[PDB]
Structure 1
């Protein structure tokens, strides 16, 4: 009959609330509850059979690697149940883009996985959450959503969990992808215009089932006058890979290169990403000799997605050439 969709709540704005309606700021993060939430969008009942669970109650900006492994596992066990057709995950928008890419890489299932958040507090005037949630259930419950990877359904759009990023603050169309949306959801109905071209879910070489721990990976920012300080400090603190958020085409200040070649020698992966995030990508051997130094380029991945790919890739290889290949297919 209808599909069986499970909602995993993890906190959010969605189920947040401010002092009021005119107040689309200052709101408290992860304020309500899953059963409470489902109960407020009774239309859901027309799309599918929905069950909800509260996995964690967090603010996405304070998320942890463990919260990620915990959510990763939980979805795996649900994906295996003969009586779960699709999964919607409620999440804070700050780090939605990281979780989404995390799940796209390690969830070896065909079943639609949908992450949704909201830009305005639920009690805010014209709050976006209702409709986003309605549409997330709409997509998780359609047989055509099967096999397209992790999906994000905000603002009437179907975005790929791999490359959508929080790019516009305050506004409802905050989530954008440099490669565009895969489709649109209008009145709970799905319209597809494009398909993913990168490895994910069912065709991924990674399995959450095989991950017990995630390695420590950190990010340093490049700008005029930057020094090697933040990089050596994160390495000294445990960073197993450093994501270099360079200016331009992943460029490294001349005052830092030496730091980076030494860190490399002492076994730290060096991944060149950039703070030029609306389009294009970082090219290998263009601004730095990646072959000579044994560094890796993050391709089109922004600093935070690149972090997600590396922590996961490093769960299986410590070979620069292998990581390069991986940044090139996922």
Structure 2
């Protein structure tokens, strides 16, 4: 009965801008290795986090595999790192799965790749890990130091941020 640190959070990675990295062959960026693993490596965690790579790019098949992976996890606190362009569509899909009803599921990512100077990625990862641990069960987007309801959120391209959709 010595103390055992639990590992209540599992992270799944689905690619996106957060993970982009330069390749000579492409003369540009590709979706690379998961940047969340780099951030957690130096986080001096008390426990650990289980990080599972799902994809590196989006068909209903791809969202369905994500829902299967999230639903089959033993953990009830889940972070999914993802591209911002279809994050709302994935989040809305996950919110329709009854098997997620007792889980806190947070999607996050970055507007700037983690491997590019001046990125929001490390901040967003810390914020989203906490959100996944602390929010009540449901599906959320955590970006810009804010929690978003997927049914009432859109990307504002001129602003470069997600914004809430006001009730009419």
Shorter-chain TM-score range: 0.7 to 0.9
Question: Match for residue 12 of structure 2?
Answer: 8
Question: Match for residue 71 of structure 1?
Answer: 66
Contact 2:124 2:143 in 1 (8 A): yes
Contact 1:18 1:28 in 2 (8 A): yes
Q: With CA pairs under 8 Å and 6+ residues apart, which has the higher RCO, 1 or 2?
A: 2
Structure 1 residues not aligned, in runs of 5+: 20-25, 180-278, 281-330
1:175 counterpart (126, 138, 162) = 162
* TM-score normalized by the length of structure 2: 0.83
Change (3 A) 1:70 1:31: same
SS in 2 for 1:66: helix
Question: For 1:31-110, what aligned pairs fall within 5 Å after superposition?
Answer: 31-33=32-34, 37-41=36-40, 42-43=42-43, 45-46=45-46, 49-58=48-57, 63-78=58-73, 81=74, 84-108=75-99, 109-110=101-102
Contact 1:6 1:87 in 2 (8 A): yes
Question: For 1:158-197, what aligned pairs fall within 5 Å after superposition?
Answer: 158-169=147-158, 171=160, 174-179=161-166
Change (3 A) 1:94 1:133: same
Change (3 A) 1:160 1:44: farther
Largest Rg, 1 or 2: 1
Question: For 1:128-147, what aligned pairs fall within 5 Å after superposition?
Answer: 128-142=120-134, 145-147=135-137
Question: Could you tell me how far apart the structure 2 residues matched to 1:111 and 1:54 are?
Answer: 19
RMSD (CA atoms) = 2.3
Question: For 1:282-297, what aligned pairs fall within 5 Å after superposition?
Answer: none
Question: Match for residue 121 of structure 1?
Answer: 113
- Which aligned runs of 4 or more in structure 1 are off by greater than 6 angstroms? none
SS in 2 for 1:70: helix
Question: Could you tell me how far apart the structure 1 residues matched to 2:98 and 2:127 are?
Answer: 22
Contact 1:76 1:107 in 2 (8 A): no
Question: Match for residue 283 of structure 1?
Answer: none
